Amino acid sequence: LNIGKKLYEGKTKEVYELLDSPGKVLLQSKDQITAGNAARKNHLEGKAAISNKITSCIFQLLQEAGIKTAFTRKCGETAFIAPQCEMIPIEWVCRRIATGSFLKRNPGVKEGYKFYPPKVELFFKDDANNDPQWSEEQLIAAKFCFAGLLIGQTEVDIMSHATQAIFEILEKSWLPQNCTLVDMKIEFGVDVTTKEIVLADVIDNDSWRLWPSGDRSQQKDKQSYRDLKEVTPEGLQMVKKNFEWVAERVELLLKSESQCRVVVLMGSTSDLGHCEKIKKACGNFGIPCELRVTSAHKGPDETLRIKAEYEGDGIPTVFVAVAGRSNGLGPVMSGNTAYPVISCPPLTPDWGVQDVWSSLRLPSGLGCSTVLSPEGSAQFAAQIFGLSNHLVWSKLRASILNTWISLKQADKKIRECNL
Amino acid sequence: LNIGKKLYEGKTKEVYELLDSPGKVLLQSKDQITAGNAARKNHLEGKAAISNKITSCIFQLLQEAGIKTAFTRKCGETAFIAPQCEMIPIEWVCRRIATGSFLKRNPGVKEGYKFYPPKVELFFKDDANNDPQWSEEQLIAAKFCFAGLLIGQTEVDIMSHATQAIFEILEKSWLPQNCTLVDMKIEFGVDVTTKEIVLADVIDNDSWRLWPSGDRSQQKDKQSYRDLKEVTPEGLQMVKKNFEWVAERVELLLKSESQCRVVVLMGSTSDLGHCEKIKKACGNFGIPCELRVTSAHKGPDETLRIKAEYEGDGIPTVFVAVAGRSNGLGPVMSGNTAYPVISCPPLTPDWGVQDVWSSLRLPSGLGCSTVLSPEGSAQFAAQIFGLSNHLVWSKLRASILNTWISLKQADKKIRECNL
Amino acid sequence: LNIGKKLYEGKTKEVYELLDSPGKVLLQSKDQITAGNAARKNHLEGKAAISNKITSCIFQLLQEAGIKTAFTRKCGETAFIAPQCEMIPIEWVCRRIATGSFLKRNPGVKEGYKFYPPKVELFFKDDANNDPQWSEEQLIAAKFCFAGLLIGQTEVDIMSHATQAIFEILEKSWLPQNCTLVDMKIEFGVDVTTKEIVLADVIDNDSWRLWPSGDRSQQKDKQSYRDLKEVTPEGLQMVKKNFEWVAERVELLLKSESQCRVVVLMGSTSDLGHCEKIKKACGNFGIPCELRVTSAHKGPDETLRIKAEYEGDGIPTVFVAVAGRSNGLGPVMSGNTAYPVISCPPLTPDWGVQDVWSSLRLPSGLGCSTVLSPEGSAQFAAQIFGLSNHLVWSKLRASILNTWISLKQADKKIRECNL
Ligand SMILES: CN(C)CCCS(=O)(=O)N1CCN(c2ccc(Br)c(NC(=O)c3coc(N)n3)c2)CC1
Ligand SMILES: CN(C)CCCS(=O)(=O)N1CCN(c2ccc(Br)c(NC(=O)c3coc(N)n3)c2)CC1
Ligand SMILES: CN(C)CCCS(=O)(=O)N1CCN(c2ccc(Br)c(NC(=O)c3coc(N)n3)c2)CC1
Ligand SMILES: Nc1c(C(=O)N[C@@H](CC(=O)O)C(=O)O)ncn1[C@@H]1O[C@H](COP(=O)(O)O)[C@@H](O)[C@H]1O
Ligand SMILES: Nc1c(C(=O)N[C@@H](CC(=O)O)C(=O)O)ncn1[C@@H]1O[C@H](COP(=O)(O)O)[C@@H](O)[C@H]1O
Ligand SMILES: Nc1c(C(=O)N[C@@H](CC(=O)O)C(=O)O)ncn1[C@@H]1O[C@H](COP(=O)(O)O)[C@@H](O)[C@H]1O
């Protein structure tokens, strides 16, 4: 591994140029912990490895959800390879529960106040002035330029929405450990290669506030260090065990907590092209999806036997019924299974106006729903698994973000058609 | 507790009439354990209390799902009150994994063969002829009678179908304990009061096969007693600990393992009647359901803020969007939430044919589904929570059964209009 | 007729290879009769000729209905040519009336109990273990192989369903002779050439139970031989006369007992392509089908005169009215004939949604039905002649089966796209 020159040395991490790989970069964590611009610089054994481990688990989690992130891979216990970024010197803060600074900047508001939606706040990176809060108006007006991307209305709006989505995803991801994610800081930079704005720096035990069972007294984050009346050698052991607790538990944010399956039933082999598209779309959400051929009209006894195969192996399953014309497959399925059924009929414009009403009007005692879009029927099935699988949810949540960013970009481009 | 005469003394339980309650009955468990028509019978301390405890939790669970079951309330440590039944002398068996007698009567079938759907079998009650298997043809031909109900085509079909649902519900209910329900036996009787066929006798540690982590060697049911080459005092201790293990865990089957919530959003207060039908229907499935008033057209900033309130407290949530005319509320909800959205528009015959296409045709990036029935929209919301909540699932599964039974009876009634 | 080596010698027939025909086979009947694994075996003059004769008429009939059956052509008095099969060692039994072993294995069931649908049972082939009944579970678990086809879920389900259709066809086919088919046994094999599962072995007077006027005491099948407390020379004469009686009547099952005709009326010669599809489809069911050109709008006096021509020669007739636009031809036909009328308008996606209501809404006094599919209109015409012509019925019944088999295979194929 071909180390280059030191591009930045921070209190807890160094960034190197990678001579062997053009426009990539190595972030080395150090065995260092700190509190503000105070005198807490304190060497801590194994901290480097814990910090690197967390940012790698989080960045991979966020990346596999579809958040645009500056991360390629881990490089040993204490560093990682990422595309080179020109950092935007703004600390972006998201908070579900008012605490810390929000109390001092909003006297009257009590510890525990809930923000719906999660609150976003901007802080300019200055220690000489102790990180002062900025309005979106201040950042737009500062006309900052980084790797030749001017930070204007569109880029600030995008980072703001992204901070919220990133927080929501990490919050959702920690929930199955009965851990309340209270708040967090992230930094965005510009990928010098692509010129995309991407999550950068790190996200580790310094970056957030983590309360098991929502109990502040069991705080596992760096707050435990910042709170110590006086830092003793014995006092740093508690702090380290808190860090160890997280590092051992973060690897389970990447673990699926629920099995998900779609079963597409098609009435005819000539529907296969339509069903391929559903399988593909389920693919994009990381949901196993099986195709099967059965007719309620010509083989209803097997429609029930096939139903039973997937009903009875204990795996949580959504059925998607693909039948054109008189869709008798959706009704029979809906009426004889406790698991959800989505009719997704392969309507063409010729008889689509007439055949949709075979899917929509069923005698009650049937909860059969309708979704025309084949990618839609996957996405809906995902939304359903999203209630019980944080990985599926995170993919859906990020999808919303990126679809919104996509419109912001399209609008900026075509806005120039008016100048 | 005014005890009457003794109506039945079995090997492990007695049935008494209650002088002070007409057509009710006390089932007393005994401290007794048995296997076959051999001399394998044993006193066992605490067994009476354990057996009664289980039948009480299982019957409450089956009853709260909506299975017609002969159970009033537990009556101390070791008995329970039930409506009087004339017992039908058939042991109904349902299996999900071939073992035991299925292998002896089907040489060639390997221990572990999975039944899809679950296999149902009849055995006629006789310690004399060693409990011989019977066919539906044999039970129909028997022309049996109980509390004036002739057991014909319709009643046998009903008990057969019922055995499958009761198995499925108890199988699903044990799943969150890592416990594979392998098989079970239940007995049905006729409630002398109603003339309904109802689950009766008991369901306890004698009645089923229970494998923790699907491992036969960890079997916690009576099989562990049946299997002893010799019954020793140390051997009966293992058996008792097995029973104790179950009795500790049986209560947890009644406990909801996940939070469920529907949020109905309505555009106008004049939709409230429609929304109340959905709230009631959610009630029927035991899902908490909130109404809110918000318009996409007139107050979209609020629609999103309200959305955020339910998204942010981490309770799994189905949104149901009630908007007539140009449903703009379902789209805007669907496009800005990871959680499922069901449009349930209050369509009338006048403009319903035209307004439904505002719900059905959406741009991609949206997983909005459509369900016209207001009862249906709750049922669909149930199906969704059914994947991750065994109590909701049990209510859906039972509902299917009873709706099937209801058709079977009505067909019998109107079949007399053919004479 | 170049005989080869002897591939099998059974109790009543031998199978030879044919040296001059690759993958074909000669089945030779013998002048032999047998019952059980006892010493009941007897020479019987003319039996070979009678048995061969029946299997030939039955197989031709089943084959002409569209059942996949191993039969090429009769080869003299006492043999027939068939494709080579690896026989599957299961006797498949179908019953319409409980008798014989069904009563011995189901004590309590009275001789005469009717099965709806007809009952199917498996028996594994062994004179050793006295032909023991097997369950579908046992045959699947056997992992049997024949001509490289593994007998699994799909193949067992196919043979099971097939046994029912083959029974139904032969039951319906004997009905016009006042003969109740009580039950039957068939064997299936794998055609070594095609790898298809096909009806094989034989179906003769040994294979079924035949009761003239539903009277067991007039039984004409082998049962009359099985039942003899003692076999005497005078006793074998009765048995032989029973066999002769069947062999005289078996040919008449191939004979159409009623005349069938479809008359397609078309308004315009430019509809002819549509009308040809109906004519072909009538062909497929062996129903003679005539085209005629007549307009209700432009030549109603002729429409009636043509109608009169088919009404007057006393051949049972379905009219199929092909008129696009303002179907006036179906109404005027329907209103002026006792014979059924099916409107089959050549609707296109452009104006089909609007023109269908000229076919559907008629004043009372008219029994005009509507069938959009041109294939379907022939099929419906078949269903109608199916009530009064056993050959047409057999083709409809078989069609159902093969369409079911076709789904079963295609599901198996596409099920591999799940691995
Ligand atoms: C005016 N311009 C063109 C001159 C460039 C100055 S520099 O090349 O030397 N520059 C490199 C990036 N630096 C930097 C400084 C501090 C940090 Br942190 C990071 N972080 C990342 O690069 C990163 C990428 O991905 C992730 N997760 N982090 C980068 C800061 C110094
Ligand atoms: C004289 N004729 C009309 C017959 C009367 C004899 S009896 O009526 O007195 N007698 C028999 C045993 N029976 C019996 C025998 C054995 C049993 Br177990 C049960 N179980 C139940 O009744 C029951 C209902 O609900 C529940 N959970 N159990 C009943 C029911 C009572
Ligand atoms: C060496 N291996 C691959 C086995 C070969 C032994 S064999 O192939 O020579 N042999 C066995 C008996 N078989 C057999 C044995 C008994 C019978 Br019956 C039938 N019947 C039919 O083949 C058949 C097909 O169609 C009809 N109507 N019959 C076949 C088929 C031939
Ligand atoms: N971790 C940091 C930092 C930060 O720079 N922290 C270090 C400073 C350093 O690393 O040099 C410190 O605590 O002294 N700033 C914000 N946050 C996080 O942001 C949210 C805001 O909290 P608030 O500042 O309002 O209390 C909470 O999660 C912080 O931990
Ligand atoms: N508990 C019983 C009984 C049964 O009668 N048990 C006791 C009677 C008593 O003491 O109350 C006995 O005599 O062993 N019969 C079937 N089953 C259950 O049925 C399923 C089928 O197993 P199989 O019929 O294969 O043995 C498995 O769950 C058995 O435990
Ligand atoms: N013909 C046969 C056979 C059978 O193997 N017959 C012969 C064998 C031979 O000589 O070729 C015998 O050994 O009796 N087995 C069943 N069936 C028919 O099956 C239905 C069922 O009757 P059940 O199985 O109740 O006896 C009824 O039609 C029998 O004739």
PDB file of C-alpha atoms in Angstrom, chain A residues 138-299:
ATOM      1  CA  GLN A 138     -25.638  32.809   6.058  1.00  0.00           C
ATOM      2  CA  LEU A 139     -24.277  29.690   4.164  1.00  0.00           C
ATOM      3  CA  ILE A 140     -26.038  30.613   0.853  1.00  0.00           C
ATOM      4  CA  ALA A 141     -24.750  34.219   1.222  1.00  0.00           C
ATOM      5  CA  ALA A 142     -21.137  33.086   1.986  1.00  0.00           C
ATOM      6  CA  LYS A 143     -20.913  31.835  -1.670  1.00  0.00           C
ATOM      7  CA  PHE A 144     -18.480  28.994  -0.700  1.00  0.00           C
ATOM      8  CA  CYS A 145     -16.827  27.125  -3.632  1.00  0.00           C
ATOM      9  CA  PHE A 146     -15.316  23.610  -3.146  1.00  0.00           C
ATOM     10  CA  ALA A 147     -13.905  21.479  -6.018  1.00  0.00           C
ATOM     11  CA  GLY A 148     -15.580  24.135  -8.239  1.00  0.00           C
ATOM     12  CA  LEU A 149     -19.144  23.525  -6.926  1.00  0.00           C
ATOM     13  CA  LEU A 150     -20.616  26.793  -5.567  1.00  0.00           C
ATOM     14  CA  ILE A 151     -22.685  26.120  -2.353  1.00  0.00           C
ATOM     15  CA  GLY A 152     -26.003  27.886  -3.264  1.00  0.00           C
ATOM     16  CA  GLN A 153     -29.766  27.506  -2.612  1.00  0.00           C
ATOM     17  CA  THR A 154     -29.841  24.013  -4.280  1.00  0.00           C
ATOM     18  CA  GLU A 155     -26.741  22.529  -2.494  1.00  0.00           C
ATOM     19  CA  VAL A 156     -27.693  23.811   1.030  1.00  0.00           C
ATOM     20  CA  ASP A 157     -31.320  22.565   0.611  1.00  0.00           C
ATOM     21  CA  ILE A 158     -29.867  19.159  -0.473  1.00  0.00           C
ATOM     22  CA  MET A 159     -27.417  18.822   2.471  1.00  0.00           C
ATOM     23  CA  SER A 160     -30.235  19.863   4.903  1.00  0.00           C
ATOM     24  CA  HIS A 161     -32.688  17.167   3.657  1.00  0.00           C
ATOM     25  CA  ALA A 162     -29.796  14.596   3.536  1.00  0.00           C
ATOM     26  CA  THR A 163     -28.840  15.239   7.250  1.00  0.00           C
ATOM     27  CA  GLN A 164     -32.491  14.385   8.179  1.00  0.00           C
ATOM     28  CA  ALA A 165     -32.578  11.195   6.000  1.00  0.00           C
ATOM     29  CA  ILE A 166     -29.164  10.010   7.337  1.00  0.00           C
ATOM     30  CA  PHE A 167     -30.332  10.619  10.976  1.00  0.00           C
ATOM     31  CA  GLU A 168     -33.699   8.844  10.361  1.00  0.00           C
ATOM     32  CA  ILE A 169     -31.872   5.800   8.861  1.00  0.00           C
ATOM     33  CA  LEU A 170     -29.330   5.485  11.764  1.00  0.00           C
ATOM     34  CA  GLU A 171     -32.210   6.099  14.296  1.00  0.00           C
ATOM     35  CA  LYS A 172     -34.304   3.290  12.676  1.00  0.00           C
ATOM     36  CA  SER A 173     -31.209   1.019  12.485  1.00  0.00           C
ATOM     37  CA  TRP A 174     -30.434   1.333  16.273  1.00  0.00           C
ATOM     38  CA  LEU A 175     -34.096   0.742  17.309  1.00  0.00           C
ATOM     39  CA  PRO A 176     -33.853  -3.115  17.333  1.00  0.00           C
ATOM     40  CA  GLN A 177     -31.055  -2.774  20.015  1.00  0.00           C
ATOM     41  CA  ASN A 178     -33.544  -0.736  22.127  1.00  0.00           C
ATOM     42  CA  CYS A 179     -31.103   2.196  21.551  1.00  0.00           C
ATOM     43  CA  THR A 180     -32.585   5.712  21.201  1.00  0.00           C
ATOM     44  CA  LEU A 181     -30.374   7.752  18.819  1.00  0.00           C
ATOM     45  CA  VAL A 182     -30.767  11.202  20.444  1.00  0.00           C
ATOM     46  CA  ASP A 183     -28.850  13.440  17.969  1.00  0.00           C
ATOM     47  CA  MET A 184     -25.717  13.414  15.698  1.00  0.00           C
ATOM     48  CA  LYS A 185     -23.228  15.555  13.694  1.00  0.00           C
ATOM     49  CA  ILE A 186     -22.065  14.718  10.120  1.00  0.00           C
ATOM     50  CA  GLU A 187     -19.888  16.704   7.658  1.00  0.00           C
ATOM     51  CA  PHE A 188     -20.404  16.835   3.868  1.00  0.00           C
ATOM     52  CA  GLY A 189     -17.608  17.211   1.274  1.00  0.00           C
ATOM     53  CA  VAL A 190     -17.437  17.381  -2.578  1.00  0.00           C
ATOM     54  CA  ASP A 191     -16.085  14.238  -4.358  1.00  0.00           C
ATOM     55  CA  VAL A 192     -13.228  15.895  -6.406  1.00  0.00           C
ATOM     56  CA  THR A 193     -13.755  13.126  -9.080  1.00  0.00           C
ATOM     57  CA  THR A 194     -17.621  13.278  -9.587  1.00  0.00           C
ATOM     58  CA  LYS A 195     -18.327  16.773  -8.037  1.00  0.00           C
ATOM     59  CA  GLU A 196     -21.318  15.172  -6.184  1.00  0.00           C
ATOM     60  CA  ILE A 197     -21.954  16.346  -2.557  1.00  0.00           C
ATOM     61  CA  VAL A 198     -21.495  13.217  -0.361  1.00  0.00           C
ATOM     62  CA  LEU A 199     -21.448  12.321   3.337  1.00  0.00           C
ATOM     63  CA  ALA A 200     -17.733  12.410   4.368  1.00  0.00           C
ATOM     64  CA  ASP A 201     -15.426  12.705   7.423  1.00  0.00           C
ATOM     65  CA  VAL A 202     -16.506  10.009   9.916  1.00  0.00           C
ATOM     66  CA  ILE A 203     -19.545   8.870  11.979  1.00  0.00           C
ATOM     67  CA  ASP A 204     -18.278   7.155  15.187  1.00  0.00           C
ATOM     68  CA  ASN A 205     -18.898   7.219  18.991  1.00  0.00           C
ATOM     69  CA  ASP A 206     -17.857  10.969  18.995  1.00  0.00           C
ATOM     70  CA  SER A 207     -20.473  11.831  16.292  1.00  0.00           C
ATOM     71  CA  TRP A 208     -23.754  11.005  18.165  1.00  0.00           C
ATOM     72  CA  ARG A 209     -25.549  10.515  21.535  1.00  0.00           C
ATOM     73  CA  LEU A 210     -26.755   6.871  22.203  1.00  0.00           C
ATOM     74  CA  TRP A 211     -29.199   5.976  25.080  1.00  0.00           C
ATOM     75  CA  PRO A 212     -30.028   2.269  25.690  1.00  0.00           C
ATOM     76  CA  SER A 213     -33.794   1.902  26.641  1.00  0.00           C
ATOM     77  CA  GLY A 214     -33.856   5.747  26.158  1.00  0.00           C
ATOM     78  CA  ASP A 215     -32.110   6.108  29.626  1.00  0.00           C
ATOM     79  CA  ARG A 216     -29.655   9.119  29.580  1.00  0.00           C
ATOM     80  CA  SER A 217     -27.835   7.668  32.659  1.00  0.00           C
ATOM     81  CA  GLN A 218     -26.804   4.591  30.486  1.00  0.00           C
ATOM     82  CA  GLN A 219     -25.250   6.959  27.801  1.00  0.00           C
ATOM     83  CA  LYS A 220     -22.721   4.897  25.677  1.00  0.00           C
ATOM     84  CA  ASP A 221     -21.489   7.789  23.424  1.00  0.00           C
ATOM     85  CA  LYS A 222     -18.598  10.280  24.034  1.00  0.00           C
ATOM     86  CA  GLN A 223     -20.918  12.410  26.293  1.00  0.00           C
ATOM     87  CA  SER A 224     -19.773   9.974  29.102  1.00  0.00           C
ATOM     88  CA  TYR A 225     -16.215  11.407  28.545  1.00  0.00           C
ATOM     89  CA  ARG A 226     -17.254  15.115  28.196  1.00  0.00           C
ATOM     90  CA  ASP A 227     -19.219  14.914  31.519  1.00  0.00           C
ATOM     91  CA  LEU A 228     -16.401  13.572  33.859  1.00  0.00           C
ATOM     92  CA  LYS A 229     -15.844  16.245  36.618  1.00  0.00           C
ATOM     93  CA  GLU A 230     -12.134  15.370  36.405  1.00  0.00           C
ATOM     94  CA  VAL A 231     -10.597  12.754  34.014  1.00  0.00           C
ATOM     95  CA  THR A 232      -8.766   9.988  35.990  1.00  0.00           C
ATOM     96  CA  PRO A 233      -6.993   6.838  34.646  1.00  0.00           C
ATOM     97  CA  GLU A 234      -9.772   4.760  36.349  1.00  0.00           C
ATOM     98  CA  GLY A 235     -12.377   7.171  34.806  1.00  0.00           C
ATOM     99  CA  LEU A 236     -11.096   6.532  31.233  1.00  0.00           C
ATOM    100  CA  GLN A 237     -11.798   2.743  31.753  1.00  0.00           C
ATOM    101  CA  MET A 238     -15.606   3.346  32.075  1.00  0.00           C
ATOM    102  CA  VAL A 239     -15.411   5.590  28.928  1.00  0.00           C
ATOM    103  CA  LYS A 240     -13.476   2.862  27.005  1.00  0.00           C
ATOM    104  CA  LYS A 241     -16.000   0.088  27.996  1.00  0.00           C
ATOM    105  CA  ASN A 242     -18.842   2.390  26.694  1.00  0.00           C
ATOM    106  CA  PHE A 243     -16.918   2.643  23.331  1.00  0.00           C
ATOM    107  CA  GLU A 244     -16.336  -1.188  23.319  1.00  0.00           C
ATOM    108  CA  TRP A 245     -20.094  -1.738  23.979  1.00  0.00           C
ATOM    109  CA  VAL A 246     -20.937   0.255  20.787  1.00  0.00           C
ATOM    110  CA  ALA A 247     -18.214  -1.233  18.545  1.00  0.00           C
ATOM    111  CA  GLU A 248     -19.365  -4.789  19.365  1.00  0.00           C
ATOM    112  CA  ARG A 249     -23.044  -3.878  18.727  1.00  0.00           C
ATOM    113  CA  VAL A 250     -22.733  -1.661  15.599  1.00  0.00           C
ATOM    114  CA  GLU A 251     -21.884  -4.775  13.416  1.00  0.00           C
ATOM    115  CA  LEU A 252     -25.560  -5.894  14.056  1.00  0.00           C
ATOM    116  CA  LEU A 253     -26.901  -2.718  12.300  1.00  0.00           C
ATOM    117  CA  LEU A 254     -25.741  -4.561   9.113  1.00  0.00           C
ATOM    118  CA  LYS A 255     -27.658  -7.757  10.092  1.00  0.00           C
ATOM    119  CA  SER A 256     -31.194  -8.416   8.767  1.00  0.00           C
ATOM    120  CA  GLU A 257     -33.576  -8.914  11.751  1.00  0.00           C
ATOM    121  CA  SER A 258     -36.504 -10.332   9.677  1.00  0.00           C
ATOM    122  CA  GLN A 259     -36.782 -12.635   6.649  1.00  0.00           C
ATOM    123  CA  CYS A 260     -38.601 -11.064   3.676  1.00  0.00           C
ATOM    124  CA  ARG A 261     -40.029 -12.848   0.611  1.00  0.00           C
ATOM    125  CA  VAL A 262     -42.316 -11.850  -2.327  1.00  0.00           C
ATOM    126  CA  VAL A 263     -44.022 -14.725  -4.231  1.00  0.00           C
ATOM    127  CA  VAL A 264     -45.293 -13.606  -7.689  1.00  0.00           C
ATOM    128  CA  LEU A 265     -48.073 -15.950  -8.902  1.00  0.00           C
ATOM    129  CA  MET A 266     -48.782 -15.638 -12.666  1.00  0.00           C
ATOM    130  CA  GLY A 267     -51.812 -17.231 -14.449  1.00  0.00           C
ATOM    131  CA  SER A 268     -49.919 -17.706 -17.779  1.00  0.00           C
ATOM    132  CA  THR A 269     -46.284 -18.179 -18.947  1.00  0.00           C
ATOM    133  CA  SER A 270     -46.907 -15.297 -21.437  1.00  0.00           C
ATOM    134  CA  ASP A 271     -47.013 -12.880 -18.389  1.00  0.00           C
ATOM    135  CA  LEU A 272     -43.331 -13.751 -17.637  1.00  0.00           C
ATOM    136  CA  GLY A 273     -41.890 -10.424 -18.955  1.00  0.00           C
ATOM    137  CA  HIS A 274     -44.106  -8.400 -16.551  1.00  0.00           C
ATOM    138  CA  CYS A 275     -43.066 -10.717 -13.615  1.00  0.00           C
ATOM    139  CA  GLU A 276     -39.318 -10.409 -14.509  1.00  0.00           C
ATOM    140  CA  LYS A 277     -39.712  -6.631 -13.876  1.00  0.00           C
ATOM    141  CA  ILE A 278     -41.223  -7.347 -10.374  1.00  0.00           C
ATOM    142  CA  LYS A 279     -38.353  -9.784  -9.555  1.00  0.00           C
ATOM    143  CA  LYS A 280     -35.832  -7.087 -10.728  1.00  0.00           C
ATOM    144  CA  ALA A 281     -37.521  -4.326  -8.615  1.00  0.00           C
ATOM    145  CA  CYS A 282     -37.592  -6.674  -5.512  1.00  0.00           C
ATOM    146  CA  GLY A 283     -33.839  -7.220  -6.260  1.00  0.00           C
ATOM    147  CA  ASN A 284     -33.250  -3.421  -5.843  1.00  0.00           C
ATOM    148  CA  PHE A 285     -34.768  -3.620  -2.234  1.00  0.00           C
ATOM    149  CA  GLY A 286     -32.763  -6.838  -1.329  1.00  0.00           C
ATOM    150  CA  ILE A 287     -35.975  -8.944  -1.100  1.00  0.00           C
ATOM    151  CA  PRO A 288     -35.829 -12.585  -2.302  1.00  0.00           C
ATOM    152  CA  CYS A 289     -38.611 -12.937  -4.937  1.00  0.00           C
ATOM    153  CA  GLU A 290     -39.889 -16.242  -6.450  1.00  0.00           C
ATOM    154  CA  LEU A 291     -42.008 -16.651  -9.632  1.00  0.00           C
ATOM    155  CA  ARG A 292     -44.658 -19.437  -9.881  1.00  0.00           C
ATOM    156  CA  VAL A 293     -47.249 -20.376 -12.560  1.00  0.00           C
ATOM    157  CA  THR A 294     -50.795 -21.240 -11.344  1.00  0.00           C
ATOM    158  CA  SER A 295     -54.354 -20.469 -12.647  1.00  0.00           C
ATOM    159  CA  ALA A 296     -57.347 -19.995 -10.283  1.00  0.00           C
ATOM    160  CA  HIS A 297     -59.536 -20.671 -13.421  1.00  0.00           C
ATOM    161  CA  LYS A 298     -57.858 -23.886 -14.787  1.00  0.00           C
ATOM    162  CA  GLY A 299     -55.940 -25.197 -11.672  1.00  0.00           C
TER     163      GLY A 299
END
